[PDB]
Ligand binder design. Sequence first.
Ligand SMILES: CC(=O)O[C@H]1C(=O)[C@@]2(C)[C@H]([C@H](OC(=O)c3ccccc3)[C@]3(O)C[C@H](OC(=O)[C@H](O)[C@@H](NC(=O)c4ccccc4)c4ccccc4)C(C)=C1C3(C)C)[C@]1(OC(C)=O)CO[C@@H]1C[C@@H]2O
Ligand SMILES: Nc1nc2c(ncn2[C@@H]2O[C@H](COP(=O)(O)OP(=O)(O)OP(=O)(O)O)[C@@H](O)[C@H]2O)c(=O)[nH]1
Ligand SMILES: Nc1nc2c(ncn2[C@@H]2O[C@H](COP(=O)(O)OP(=O)(O)O)[C@@H](O)[C@H]2O)c(=O)[nH]1
Ligand SMILES: Nc1ncnc2c1ncn2[C@@H]1O[C@H](COP(=O)(O)OP(=O)(O)O)[C@@H](O)[C@H]1O
Ligand SMILES: [Mg+2]
Ligand SMILES: [Mg+2]
Lengths: 426, 411, 327
Amino acid sequence: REIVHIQAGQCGNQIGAKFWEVISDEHGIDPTGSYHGDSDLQLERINVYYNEAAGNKYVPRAILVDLEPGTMDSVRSGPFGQIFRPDNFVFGQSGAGNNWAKGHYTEGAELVDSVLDVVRKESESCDCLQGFQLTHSLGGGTGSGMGTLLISKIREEYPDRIMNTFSVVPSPKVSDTVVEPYNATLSVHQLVENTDETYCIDNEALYDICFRTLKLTTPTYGDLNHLVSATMSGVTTCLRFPGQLNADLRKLAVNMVPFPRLHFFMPGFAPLTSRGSQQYRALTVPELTQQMFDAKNMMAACDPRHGRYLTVAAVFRGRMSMKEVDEQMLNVQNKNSSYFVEWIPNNVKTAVCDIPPRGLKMSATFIGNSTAIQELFKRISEQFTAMFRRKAFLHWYTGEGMDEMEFTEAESNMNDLVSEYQQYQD
Amino acid sequence: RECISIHVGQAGVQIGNACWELYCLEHGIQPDHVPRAVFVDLEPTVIDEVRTGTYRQLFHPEQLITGKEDAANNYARGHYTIGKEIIDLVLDRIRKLADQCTGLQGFSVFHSFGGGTGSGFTSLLMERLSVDYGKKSKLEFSIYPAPQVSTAVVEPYNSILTTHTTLEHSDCAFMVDNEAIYDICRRNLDIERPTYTNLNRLIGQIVSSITASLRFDGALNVDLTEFQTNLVPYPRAHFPLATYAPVISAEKAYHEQLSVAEITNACFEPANQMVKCDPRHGKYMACCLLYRGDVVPKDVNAAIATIKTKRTIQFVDWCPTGFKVGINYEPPTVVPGGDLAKVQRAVCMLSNTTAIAEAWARLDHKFDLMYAKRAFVHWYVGEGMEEGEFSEAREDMAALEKDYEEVGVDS
Amino acid sequence: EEAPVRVALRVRPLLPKELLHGHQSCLQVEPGLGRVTLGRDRHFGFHVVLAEDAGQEAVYQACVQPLLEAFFEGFNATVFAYGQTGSGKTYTMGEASVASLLEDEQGIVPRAMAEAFKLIDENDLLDCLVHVSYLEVYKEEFRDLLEVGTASRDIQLREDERGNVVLCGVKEVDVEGLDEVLSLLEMGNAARHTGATHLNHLSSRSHTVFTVTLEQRGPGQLLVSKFHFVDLAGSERVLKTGSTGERLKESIQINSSLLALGNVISALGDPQRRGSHIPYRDSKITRILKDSLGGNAKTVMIACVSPSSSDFDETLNTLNYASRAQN
Ligand SMILES: CC(=O)O[C@H]1C(=O)[C@@]2(C)[C@H]([C@H](OC(=O)c3ccccc3)[C@]3(O)C[C@H](OC(=O)[C@H](O)[C@@H](NC(=O)c4ccccc4)c4ccccc4)C(C)=C1C3(C)C)[C@]1(OC(C)=O)CO[C@@H]1C[C@@H]2O
Ligand SMILES: Nc1nc2c(ncn2[C@@H]2O[C@H](COP(=O)(O)OP(=O)(O)OP(=O)(O)O)[C@@H](O)[C@H]2O)c(=O)[nH]1
Ligand SMILES: Nc1nc2c(ncn2[C@@H]2O[C@H](COP(=O)(O)OP(=O)(O)O)[C@@H](O)[C@H]2O)c(=O)[nH]1
Ligand SMILES: Nc1ncnc2c1ncn2[C@@H]1O[C@H](COP(=O)(O)OP(=O)(O)O)[C@@H](O)[C@H]1O
Ligand SMILES: [Mg+2]
Ligand SMILES: [Mg+2]
């Protein structure tokens, strides 16, 4: 089973960079070098995220897309800047303007067909394709406009596979681009009709974890991308190793969403410790069962306690007992059982791998869907319609082919997407 | 003929892994005859477990079947298109095994409901076997859904659609659940790490009490075909409950002044029978036993007497006696990595009760709650289903529970 | 300005080829009592019940004549053709019907444009302009039927700040006569008879969209009325399970669109659910009926039911659908 990876945007570029720099270390891959796992267990399923060419090189089957050559030139000169086949770099020399419509109408359309050529080269390059990994951000037409333009051509091209969306939704109180939030509405207008799975990521929860719970003072972005890389690495290839009870992307797709409105997801990585001090003899699923289900250790900007739960998708890994999996899950089904909505009896999905990570003895990964994302996209809707009105620095978008009706239909689509969760909270 | 068997589902494949380890130890099967069964799964990884280290060298590998497509844990997708590409090769391999055997006995089927993958493939597999080899023995064991210890989100819908194919394609059926096996591993095994690798040993222990050294070299046989019309009252394919009693440790449980009658009476104690079908109101219609080890049959026709004279575990009114006594000479066998007892006599049991409809209510109301809001329907529409099959499955369970209402306790 | 739902029921008379196989009847239409005897026990009431002796002018005077006043008073108007394939949906709409030669045998479409110009010249004080638009919906996509071809990936939907459904990429013709209307609908049907000029692979399984629209302006009160001619797909359901590999997506289209529309009308079924979220966003034909379903609009439901016993359970499913939605 085979999956490829998409990188759009500078933030998506950094996310993908640290992701490959983690996941190649899990299989034991020297950058120029080869497999070096001391067991054969790291080798048995490497056809997922790699392709053999010469017994030494193992090329990551990935996509390199930006509207600026300097960011990917910084990537290719960095730590693992030799592991990519450089033809996979795809970029125009044009402006990386922050308009969604710049990346979706004109200055993305200059670069769509090359990306389509690369994904048609790499889809049927090898055996049966499984899914697609979209890492991008909403804070740039690189990720917002050209990202949704890519996957909107993909789902008309490939109606079969799974569209993993890794989005960076701008946090409301820490909004580091003042001219941003139109791009969020335009992005989410054409996410909800194309993908199936979106693990929305919010930066302020990462600052909350690494800066409050972890006592590491400096919030260097390498640590943030390191945490997001650990989060996504506790999803896919963890379920593509030997496991006691293993799943795939499609099982979580059938488990989590009620409806085919595809009902966005909240990721979470369980073991978070201060660097050396937090050795504490509290190491089990149980401590991790409690660590996943708090207001922190949740990458949503919204508070996940404030609202119901739809589906707990827990991913466990390490040598462990299933009775003290299901017993802890019954405790979660009984304590918070008020906002754990009752008419779906099992709200839990269990994913068990055999292997630990490289250094840690046991770890877990949480994937969530609550009604609390209503009180994140309502806040984004409020920040949209607040400074939609005065229009005085809105006329950047009009001359790029964007019309007046598109914004309002995007508003209504995102707003009744909020309204269905306004319904199902009760 | 050793009931050439099938296995499907990661539960089914691993439970056959431990069961098959018990098989290849209990006869002194060296790693140098032939494995007399097949392993089929829609994921290659669970099969490549055994195809990597232990028992890869044992097996001729040219006869196990994998599917390179998706896992597809939903009854619609598992029954339909994504499992269509595998069924024919499986049929040709099992007909090769039907040709190489001579005077076979039947089919023991190991799968589960917990996920659509080992359910719909299982369903049309049993359907095609009823077309091909319907004048044979069809025994099926599936792992029953949990009432509240459940794992899959989509846990009901698979089993609800699976209640049709278990009706008109097998006759005897076993549905043992995880929950009270965890209760066994806490209470009577006396460990606090229950992993599936021991539950698989327990089901392998109960099937090794059914079949293997009984049929293979030895002379005191008790027939499978003398079960399938000695365990149903009436030929609606009812659902007996099997229970392996001496689950005590060979480490701490040195109650070594032990006889047959203790575990014999412990075959009828409520909180030990691996399902939530205690005789609170369920009554007994047939309680065929199998003993292995040492038998003074005075213990048999004294334990039967002292159960008969309780008037608390009341039998069926119309069924006068329903017993059949299996006596085998050979003891069970303990795997060195295992945990079982190594006791010179041992008793498994099996019996059909009334209160299976209680677990059916536990599954049925659970189905109807999420059915009421039209919960997950778009996946099953996306692999070609309809509302009418849900309606037929609902009324199928209704007909089954009415049948258990009349022909059971009511006279 | 918000009105409840009006319902019209019409039986067609029996066609010969559905009788030549030796079929019989299963209905007993009670026009005064307002229901029918389906088989023996099924007695399903409605608003307007007509037997198998009805013309297009009878349904026109019964329902469209109250619709025309509201359309000439600034209210939205929508009629839609539901029923079995062969039960007479194309006859019920009768977009500029021709082959059915007799004057009582063409449908509402020439009749509304025949009665428009009697009041257009009388309403010459207010600004009155009438423009038309004829479209097709199939495979969860669109088709400009006033065009020989335009890519459905290039045509998308919109929505305005007032809160109504807006279209783009659609040809508009300010009409001044019935000749232009029936010419463009001759061409519309002549360029999509089997389905957008292509080999009929159940072209009646698609949806087709037509819309008449009148504006109102003098001190300049902008209240624009629409007179929709919606023409739906068939009421039947195809099991289809293995037909051509994985290409049962046509069944996915109609089954998803009508389960979505069924959840919409069943959300109007229980009055507890009519304060809930109405899932228009599952299908395009549901989004085009968003402002059409209630609000300031005007709604007449017509489900072409079958007379014979050969269509017994399918007409039962149709009557169940109308009893859940017929309102
Ligand atoms: C022997 C050992 O485990 O020491 C750890 C360690 O003590 C802790 C502090 C590590 C340490 O990580 C962090 O503090 C951290 C910093 C920024 C963002 C996220 C985490 C560690 O950096 C992390 C790292 O742990 C790993 O090696 C995991 O396999 C990790 N892989 C990488 O971090 C990695 C390193 C080099 C290149 C590429 C990747 C992993 C685990 C799960 C999923 C993905 C990756 C190492 C050795 C340690 C330190 C350095 C202290 C912890 O994090 C992870 C992901 O393992 C935080 O708590 C976990 C486990 C430990 O408590
Ligand atoms: N007792 C026992 N139960 C198991 C074991 N493995 C899994 N189960 C349970 O049985 C159910 C069936 O396992 P699955 O892995 O879903 O088998 P499947 O339905 O064919 O689906 P796949 O994942 O594709 O194999 C699971 O939901 C588990 O809850 C096991 O080893 N022992
Ligand atoms: N956590 C994290 N967020 C980032 C990083 N770089 C950028 N972002 C966020 O991503 C948003 C958009 O970045 P992006 O669109 O990729 O940059 P662009 O491609 O040049 O437009 C910005 O608002 C940043 O807040 C990073 O290294 N780490
Ligand atoms: N009530 C009716 N009165 C007279 N003719 C009818 C009636 N209903 C259907 N027909 C005839 O049946 C023919 C085919 O019906 P059609 O409208 O194509 O069915 P549908 O559009 O529902 O598939 C039409 O040419 C029409 O003349
Ligand atoms: Mg399995
Ligand atoms: Mg027709």
